[PDB]
Design a binder for this molecule. Structure first.
Ligand SMILES: NC(=O)c1cccc(CCCN(CC[C@H](N)C(=O)O)C[C@H]2O[C@H](n3cnc4c(N)ncnc43)[C@H](O)[C@@H]2O)c1
Length: 270
């Protein structure tokens, strides 16, 4: 190990190897650190609230809706699906980490040991006009998630041989920066994601800007430090047209990530 001198699993290649996500990425430590939502005025909670409003705006105010949505790099989180659940009949959650998928399946089973998303759920229910309350919202999402799949964005077939309909939308929050060691892999990963999408289908990405790493407690993982111009260039080259692109100044605490804000985009496959 490098003891923080360099991200974990990065000493040789310069970027966290994916094996590291099967060894040192602890979903409970990640959820505890980033999605606790116990104090709203934290840097973490401020970021999450902005992500939720955008996902709410994308799926419930805009037209982004359809039959199948595939979430790419879900990790152990479900916040990114609460609003999409209202406009998509079927949701497929995917990640590279088996530990993350296990943590997800625990929440889908509503196991008592699963993570408590209750305050995040309540926030989304208030965004959507309080038509329902927390427990009813959670159950609607639990029924929408039809598949929990292994995923690798660096592969031509990110979901392997699992057959799926062409999706109406592909969603990916906070994953591509962590998964792609360079800009060519990033652009190819966006092309790989397009293999799951209908022509003219929607692509929704939210990720950090200009971040070289993120922390889970004392564990450092690599992130690809993209600027807005680089993201825009990679999205267009991968075969999409951008519908809207938003950049926010809000950052994670320097103790958790070295990002300079976040971006949010909706694109369509040309
Ligand atoms: N970049 C930063 O600064 C920054 C800022 C804040 C937080 C973070 C950590 C993000 C952790 N998850 C996001 C989970 C969820 N969507 C969510 O929103 O939190 C990344 C997930 O994707 C990883 N992954 C790595 N290789 C992957 C591959 N080949 N295929 C698919 N997945 C891959 C892991 O599996 C993670 O589960 C980074």
């Amino acid at each position: 190990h490098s003891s923080g001198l360099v991200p974990r699993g990065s000493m040789e290649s310069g970027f966290t190897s994916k094996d590291t996500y099967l060894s040192h990425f602890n979903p409970r430590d990640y959820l505890e650190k980033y999605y606790k939502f116990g104090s709203r005025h934290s840097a973490e909670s401020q970021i999450l609230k902005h992500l939720l409003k955008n996902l709410f705006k994308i799926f419930c105010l805009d037209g982004v809706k359809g039959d199948l949505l595939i979430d790419i790099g879900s990790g152990p989180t479900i916040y990114q699906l609460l609003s999409a659940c209202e406009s998509f009949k079927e949701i497929v959650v995917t990640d590279y980490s088996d530990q993350n998928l296990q943590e997800l399946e625990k929440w889908l089973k509503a196991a008592p040991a699963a993570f408590d998303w209750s305050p995040v759920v309540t926030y989304v229910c208030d965004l959507e006009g309080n038509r329902v309350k927390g427990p009813e919202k959670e159950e609607k999402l639990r029924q929408a998630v039809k598949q929990v799949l292994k995923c690798d964005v660096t592969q031509s077939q990110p979901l392997g041989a699992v057959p799926l309909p062409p999706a109406d939308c592909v969603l990916s929050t906070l994953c591509l920066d962590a998964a792609c060691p360079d800009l060519p892999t990033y652009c190819r990963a966006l092309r790989n994601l397009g293999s799951l999408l209908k022509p003219g289908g929607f692509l929704v990405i939210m990720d950090a800007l200009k971040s070289s790493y993120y922390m889970i407690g004392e564990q450092k993982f690599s992130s690809l430090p993209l600027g807005r111009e680089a993201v825009e260039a990679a999205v267009k080259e991968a075969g999409y047209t951008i519908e809207w692109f938003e950049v926010i100044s809000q950052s994670y605490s320097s103790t958790m990530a070295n990002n300079e804000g976040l971006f949010s985009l909706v694109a369509r496959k040309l």
